């Protein structure tokens, strides 16, 4: 995703699913190659100690002054018609200048953005339609003209453009914070288990303090872990052995 040669236009933002792997987030948060690295509802360092069922890397390209629209509850052409984040987003936004790659003498027009739409996009909605936008009361019937405009427009990416207008590559990492089996964990190592003692335990990011004992609960093959009345954990399933 980050080393991808070619990025998708913001209106047709690419999505890459990450599953069943170890995520060494250091390679990102220790790198100096990024201008914007903004994580909402999460700190990247702690991601080394966390598991998830899925991660989604949404990749695209915009101009610099629109990077601010990549954030929860923002407005504008991008956040409205191209790529909308939810207000309760939990994940990271990474953006870095790509003038050396996406801009050329004479202007690179391969990257587009949607200029018109009858309504704002819902979070993580993807609209790739090229329907003629009916600005007026007259049906267009797929014919451009007065009050009938093509919904997309190219970015003018020249190397001499202002940093505000220069191309920036954007990657959006979203985590599947669900109660289900997790296949995306961090590089943190595991240790041996100690029973019948007061310990500070961490099971797949579920942290706590208590005494772990062999249970007699009739857990089902799928049950990840149990709770008591107070919505608190009462029994767990060892990630390493059943």
């Amino acid at each position, epitope marked *: 995703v980050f080393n991808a040669t070619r990025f998708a236009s913001v209106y047709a933002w690419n999505r890459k699913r990450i599953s069943n792997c170890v995520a060494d987030y250091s390679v990102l948060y220790n790198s100096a190659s990024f201008s914007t690295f903004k994580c909402y509802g999460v700190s990247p360092t702690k991601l080394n100690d966390l598991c998830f069922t899925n991660v989604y890397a949404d990749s695209f390209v915009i101009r610099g002054d629109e990077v601010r629209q990549i954030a929860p509850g923002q407005t504008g052409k991008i956040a409205d018609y191209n790529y909308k984040l939810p207000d309760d987003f939990t994940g990271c936004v990474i953006a870095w200048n790509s003038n050396n790659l996406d801009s050329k003498v*004479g*202007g690179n*027009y*391969n990257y*587009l953005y949607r*200029l*018109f739409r009858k309504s704002n996009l819902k979070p993580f909605e993807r609209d790739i339609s*090229t329907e*003629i936008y009916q600005a007026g009361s007259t049906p267009c019937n*797929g*014919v*451009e*003209g007065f009050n009938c*405009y*093509f*919904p*997309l*427009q*190219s970015y003018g990416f020249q190397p001499t453009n202002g940093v505000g207008y220069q191309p920036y590559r954007v990657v959006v990492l979203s985590f599947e914070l669900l109660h289900a089996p997790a296949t995306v964990c961090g590089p943190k190592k595991s240790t041996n288990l100690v029973k019948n003692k007061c310990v500070n335990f961490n099971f797949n990011g579920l942290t706590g303090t208590g005494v772990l004992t062999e249970s007699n609960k009739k857990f089902l093959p799928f049950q990840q872990f149990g709770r008591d009345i107070a919505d608190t954990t009462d029994a767990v399933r060892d990630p390493q052995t059943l």
Partner: nanobody
Amino acid sequence: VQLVESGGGLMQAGGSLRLSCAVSGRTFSTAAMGWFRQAPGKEREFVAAIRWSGGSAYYADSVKGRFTISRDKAKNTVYLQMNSLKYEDTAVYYCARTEYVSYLLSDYATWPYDYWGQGTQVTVSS
């Protein structure tokens, strides 16, 4: 990337000719194709444009109701059907291509295009 024109040549007034322009070589994307013409001693002049997506067409006033621009995406070819030929249509006709996507089709009349064909002579006789 090359634009290869064909067709045209000599035709008597009132007749019809078709020009072709085939795009060869690796393209990332095509926004629009256009036809221009240059009569001897005169400035090169817009004739017609077509958006690659959707196929909406824009015409110079001088050719409306006479010329039709069309596209075959699979053949990466643009056509100009030149009906009701007049002496004033005598010119070298040039194919043009751009990757610039404007929301506004009429922009293709005045947009500087990136790629140009070699030009094909059309001569209208009596």
